[PDB]
């Protein structure tokens, strides 16, 4: 078998379930793939260059997670698909000597939901892609952050940006900050209680522990969902491209969900 190497760039990265689900599909599909992929977590120094590292490790493909998604977008040779609108890349693919960037977050998230407006907490690559996705769906979208980071992007999108909590009800309250990953809240407890009383879904992109955000929603009887299904969907959409579009995402999905 011809071997191909893949990875996931993150910092931190060791918590990640991506290698598990990706390697399960590489093993299942090597027949139709006609190569065997192996997939590895990569702690990337903040000071490093993604493209250099991608080229240097000889990768055929990779995923990007926090905090590199907007940086991945900058250093690609070409951007394709809905990533052109998100200013972030979660998926990287070597195409005829070009580093090509995709973003599967918008679609993975969308697919993960079984809502008229949304409050998005956070402003990195994740929050951008969800904002993008929810605007397309015709939701009214508000973004709440601590600073003027990525404001320009959210305003060209047509979002309402806030730095102080809007006194307003939202169907969807979405945590796209890095807070849960550090086991803390993304917002003052009582503010967030306010939104949870009024909301129809508290959604956290972090996965596989009961985060402070989800825990508070749970204590209050608000419906809540962590990012495990989004994770499986993104990954399945990533694997589709890693298979240069031979394996549809729905087949990857079935295998990933089950290994997970």
Short mmCIF file of C-alpha atoms in Angstrom, two decimals:
data_model
loop_
_atom_site.label_atom_id
_atom_site.label_comp_id
_atom_site.label_asym_id
_atom_site.label_seq_id
_atom_site.Cartn_x
_atom_site.Cartn_y
_atom_site.Cartn_z
CA UNK A 1 0.00 0.00 0.00
CA UNK A 2 0.95 3.59 -0.77
CA UNK A 3 0.85 5.47 2.57
CA UNK A 4 -0.43 9.03 3.11
CA UNK A 5 -0.06 11.13 6.26
CA UNK A 6 -2.65 13.39 7.80
CA UNK A 7 -2.91 15.28 11.00
CA UNK A 8 -4.72 17.79 13.08
CA UNK A 9 -2.94 21.05 13.96
CA UNK A 10 -3.97 22.44 17.35
CA UNK A 11 -2.71 24.02 20.60
CA UNK A 12 -3.61 22.38 22.76
CA UNK A 13 -4.37 19.24 20.74
CA UNK A 14 -3.94 16.10 22.88
CA UNK A 15 -7.64 16.04 23.93
CA UNK A 16 -8.64 15.58 20.30
CA UNK A 17 -10.93 12.76 19.00
CA UNK A 18 -10.09 13.46 15.38
CA UNK A 19 -7.35 10.83 15.07
CA UNK A 20 -9.68 8.14 16.31
CA UNK A 21 -12.52 8.75 13.91
CA UNK A 22 -10.27 9.52 10.91
CA UNK A 23 -8.10 6.47 11.33
CA UNK A 24 -11.27 4.27 11.66
CA UNK A 25 -12.29 5.49 8.17
CA UNK A 26 -8.83 5.22 6.69
CA UNK A 27 -8.78 1.59 7.78
CA UNK A 28 -12.26 0.86 6.52
CA UNK A 29 -11.87 2.52 3.13
CA UNK A 30 -8.30 1.68 2.06
CA UNK A 31 -9.75 -0.65 -0.57
CA UNK A 32 -11.65 2.12 -2.41
CA UNK A 33 -9.03 4.62 -1.41
CA UNK A 34 -6.18 2.41 -2.76
CA UNK A 35 -3.96 4.04 -0.24
CA UNK A 36 -3.73 3.88 3.50
CA UNK A 37 -3.99 7.12 5.46
CA UNK A 38 -2.56 7.56 8.89
CA UNK A 39 -3.63 10.50 11.03
CA UNK A 40 -1.81 12.10 13.96
CA UNK A 41 -2.35 14.97 16.44
CA UNK A 42 0.17 17.79 15.98
CA UNK A 43 0.93 20.20 18.80
CA UNK A 44 1.89 23.25 16.78
CA UNK A 45 3.97 25.96 18.46
CA UNK A 46 2.07 29.29 18.18
CA UNK A 47 5.26 30.69 16.61
CA UNK A 48 5.21 28.18 13.79
CA UNK A 49 4.01 28.42 10.24
CA UNK A 50 1.16 26.00 9.31
CA UNK A 51 1.97 25.72 5.59
CA UNK A 52 5.71 25.19 6.32
CA UNK A 53 4.88 22.52 8.86
CA UNK A 54 2.31 20.92 6.54
CA UNK A 55 4.89 20.83 3.70
CA UNK A 56 7.71 19.76 6.01
CA UNK A 57 5.85 16.77 7.49
CA UNK A 58 4.88 15.71 4.04
CA UNK A 59 1.14 15.70 4.76
CA UNK A 60 -1.48 14.91 2.12
CA UNK A 61 -4.21 16.54 4.16
CA UNK A 62 -4.90 18.00 7.62
CA UNK A 63 -7.45 19.51 9.90
CA UNK A 64 -6.98 22.78 11.79
CA UNK A 65 -8.47 23.48 15.21
CA UNK A 66 -7.95 26.25 17.85
CA UNK A 67 -6.32 28.68 17.61
CA UNK A 68 -5.12 28.38 14.02
CA UNK A 69 -8.25 28.42 11.84
CA UNK A 70 -8.00 32.11 10.70
CA UNK A 71 -4.25 31.69 10.23
CA UNK A 72 -4.81 28.57 8.10
CA UNK A 73 -6.96 30.76 5.81
CA UNK A 74 -4.13 33.36 5.41
CA UNK A 75 -1.42 30.91 4.32
CA UNK A 76 -3.27 28.65 1.92
CA UNK A 77 -2.42 28.94 -1.75
CA UNK A 78 -6.09 28.60 -2.73
CA UNK A 79 -9.38 28.71 -0.77
CA UNK A 80 -12.41 26.68 -1.95
CA UNK A 81 -16.07 26.53 -1.03
CA UNK A 82 -17.84 28.23 1.80
CA UNK A 83 -14.42 29.00 3.47
CA UNK A 84 -14.11 31.92 1.05
CA UNK A 85 -16.88 33.50 3.13
CA UNK A 86 -15.82 32.39 6.64
CA UNK A 87 -12.30 33.78 6.76
CA UNK A 88 -11.32 30.48 8.38
CA UNK A 89 -10.12 27.03 7.32
CA UNK A 90 -10.58 23.82 9.19
CA UNK A 91 -9.50 21.48 6.42
CA UNK A 92 -6.34 21.34 4.38
CA UNK A 93 -5.58 19.36 1.25
CA UNK A 94 -2.56 19.12 -1.01
CA UNK A 95 -3.83 19.49 -4.58
CA UNK A 96 -1.33 19.33 -7.40
CA UNK A 97 1.39 21.04 -5.36
CA UNK A 98 -1.09 23.63 -3.98
CA UNK A 99 -2.20 23.89 -0.34
CA UNK A 100 -5.97 24.12 -0.57
CA UNK A 101 -8.23 25.30 2.26
CA UNK A 102 -11.81 24.32 3.09
CA UNK A 103 -14.12 24.94 5.99
CA UNK A 104 -16.54 22.20 7.04
CA UNK A 105 -17.66 23.88 10.34
CA UNK A 106 -20.58 25.80 8.89
CA UNK A 107 -22.08 22.64 7.41
CA UNK A 108 -21.16 20.27 10.27
CA UNK A 109 -22.89 22.61 12.68
CA UNK A 110 -25.84 23.03 10.50
CA UNK A 111 -26.22 19.22 10.10
CA UNK A 112 -25.83 18.78 13.86
CA UNK A 113 -29.07 20.63 14.61
CA UNK A 114 -32.43 18.76 14.57
CA UNK A 115 -34.86 28.71 15.37
CA UNK A 116 -35.45 32.44 14.43
CA UNK A 117 -32.30 34.07 15.94
CA UNK A 118 -29.05 33.28 17.61
CA UNK A 119 -26.54 34.72 20.00
CA UNK A 120 -22.98 33.61 19.20
CA UNK A 121 -20.42 33.94 21.95
CA UNK A 122 -16.88 34.23 20.67
CA UNK A 123 -14.99 35.61 17.74
CA UNK A 124 -12.39 33.19 16.43
CA UNK A 125 -12.63 31.00 13.33
CA UNK A 126 -15.47 28.90 14.77
CA UNK A 127 -17.70 31.82 15.56
CA UNK A 128 -17.11 33.24 12.08
CA UNK A 129 -18.16 30.06 10.32
CA UNK A 130 -21.35 29.66 12.42
CA UNK A 131 -22.29 33.30 11.87
CA UNK A 132 -21.79 32.75 8.18
CA UNK A 133 -23.94 29.65 8.31
CA UNK A 134 -26.74 31.18 10.37
CA UNK A 135 -26.99 34.27 8.17
CA UNK A 136 -27.47 32.02 5.14
CA UNK A 137 -30.29 30.21 6.95
CA UNK A 138 -32.04 33.54 7.42
CA UNK A 139 -31.61 33.68 11.18
CA UNK A 140 -31.04 37.02 12.86
CA UNK A 141 -27.63 36.78 14.45
CA UNK A 142 -25.98 38.67 17.22
CA UNK A 143 -22.36 38.29 18.21
CA UNK A 144 -21.11 38.92 21.70
CA UNK A 145 -17.48 39.50 22.49
CA UNK A 146 -15.09 41.02 24.97
CA UNK A 147 -13.32 43.24 22.35
CA UNK A 148 -13.37 44.63 18.79
CA UNK A 149 -11.81 41.42 17.44
CA UNK A 150 -13.09 40.33 14.04
CA UNK A 151 -15.75 42.99 14.22
CA UNK A 152 -15.22 44.10 10.65
CA UNK A 153 -15.95 40.56 9.34
CA UNK A 154 -19.14 40.10 11.43
CA UNK A 155 -20.46 43.48 10.26
CA UNK A 156 -19.86 42.83 6.57
CA UNK A 157 -21.78 39.61 7.18
CA UNK A 158 -24.76 41.70 8.40
CA UNK A 159 -24.55 40.52 12.05
CA UNK A 160 -25.32 42.62 15.10
CA UNK A 161 -22.17 42.94 17.13
CA UNK A 162 -22.16 43.52 20.83
CA UNK A 163 -19.51 43.82 23.48
CA UNK A 164 -22.10 44.44 26.21
CA UNK A 165 -24.89 41.80 26.54
CA UNK A 166 -27.97 42.71 24.49
CA UNK A 167 -31.19 42.80 26.53
CA UNK A 168 -32.95 40.44 24.25
CA UNK A 169 -34.28 36.89 23.91
CA UNK A 170 -32.50 34.32 21.63
CA UNK A 171 -33.65 30.92 20.47
CA UNK A 172 -30.07 29.69 20.03
CA UNK A 173 -27.24 30.49 22.43
CA UNK A 174 -23.95 29.33 21.07
CA UNK A 175 -20.67 29.08 22.89
CA UNK A 176 -17.80 29.43 20.37
CA UNK A 177 -15.25 30.87 22.83
CA UNK A 178 -12.31 28.92 24.24
CA UNK A 179 -13.74 29.16 27.73
CA UNK A 180 -15.10 25.60 28.17
CA UNK A 181 -11.76 24.13 27.12
CA UNK A 182 -10.29 25.93 30.17
CA UNK A 183 -13.23 24.84 32.27
CA UNK A 184 -14.71 28.26 32.65
CA UNK A 185 -17.80 30.24 31.63
CA UNK A 186 -17.85 32.41 28.51
CA UNK A 187 -20.09 35.02 30.28
CA UNK A 188 -21.17 36.33 33.70
CA UNK A 189 -23.28 33.59 35.30
CA UNK A 190 -26.45 35.70 35.83
CA UNK A 191 -26.38 37.21 32.33
CA UNK A 192 -26.29 33.72 30.91
CA UNK A 193 -29.08 32.55 33.27
CA UNK A 194 -31.06 35.38 31.70
CA UNK A 195 -30.57 34.02 28.19
CA UNK A 196 -31.13 30.41 29.24
CA UNK A 197 -34.57 31.18 30.73
CA UNK A 198 -35.58 32.64 27.39
CA UNK A 199 -33.77 30.33 25.01
CA UNK A 200 -34.68 27.22 23.09
CA UNK A 201 -31.15 25.77 22.78
CA UNK A 202 -27.83 26.19 24.66
CA UNK A 203 -25.19 24.85 22.33
CA UNK A 204 -21.52 24.43 23.10
CA UNK A 205 -18.91 23.51 20.44
CA UNK A 206 -16.62 21.93 23.04
CA UNK A 207 -17.27 18.20 23.45
CA UNK A 208 -17.06 15.27 25.88
CA UNK A 209 -17.31 16.84 29.29
CA UNK A 210 -20.25 18.68 30.89
CA UNK A 211 -18.89 22.22 30.42
CA UNK A 212 -19.71 25.04 32.88
CA UNK A 213 -21.87 26.61 30.09
CA UNK A 214 -23.87 23.37 29.48
CA UNK A 215 -23.95 22.58 33.20
CA UNK A 216 -25.62 25.90 33.93
CA UNK A 217 -28.16 25.26 31.13
CA UNK A 218 -28.85 21.83 32.51
CA UNK A 219 -29.35 23.09 36.09
CA UNK A 220 -31.91 25.52 34.65
CA UNK A 221 -33.84 23.01 32.45
CA UNK A 222 -32.85 24.58 29.11
CA UNK A 223 -32.27 22.11 26.23
CA UNK A 224 -28.59 21.74 25.68
CA UNK A 225 -26.22 20.15 23.22
CA UNK A 226 -22.40 19.78 23.15
CA UNK A 227 -20.24 19.69 20.00
CA UNK A 228 -19.86 15.91 19.65
CA UNK A 229 -22.29 15.63 16.66
CA UNK A 230 -20.79 18.70 15.00
CA UNK A 231 -17.42 16.97 15.52
CA UNK A 232 -18.53 13.79 13.76
CA UNK A 233 -20.14 15.77 10.89
CA UNK A 234 -17.11 18.10 10.35
CA UNK A 235 -14.85 15.14 10.41
CA UNK A 236 -16.98 13.21 7.99
CA UNK A 237 -17.05 16.28 5.71
CA UNK A 238 -13.26 16.52 6.08
CA UNK A 239 -12.76 12.89 5.27
CA UNK A 240 -14.84 13.34 2.09
CA UNK A 241 -12.20 15.83 0.83
CA UNK A 242 -9.28 13.67 2.13
CA UNK A 243 -10.73 10.95 -0.04
CA UNK A 244 -10.61 13.45 -2.94
CA UNK A 245 -14.40 13.10 -3.02
CA UNK A 246 -14.54 9.34 -3.51
CA UNK A 247 -16.23 8.61 -0.14
CA UNK A 248 -19.41 10.61 0.60
CA UNK A 249 -19.57 12.23 4.01
CA UNK A 250 -22.64 10.18 5.02
CA UNK A 251 -20.63 6.92 4.79
CA UNK A 252 -17.70 8.37 6.73
CA UNK A 253 -20.29 9.67 9.20
CA UNK A 254 -21.75 6.18 9.89
CA UNK A 255 -18.30 4.71 10.59
CA UNK A 256 -17.12 7.66 12.69
CA UNK A 257 -20.26 7.82 14.81
CA UNK A 258 -19.98 4.14 15.55
CA UNK A 259 -16.29 4.18 16.46
CA UNK A 260 -17.00 7.24 18.57
#
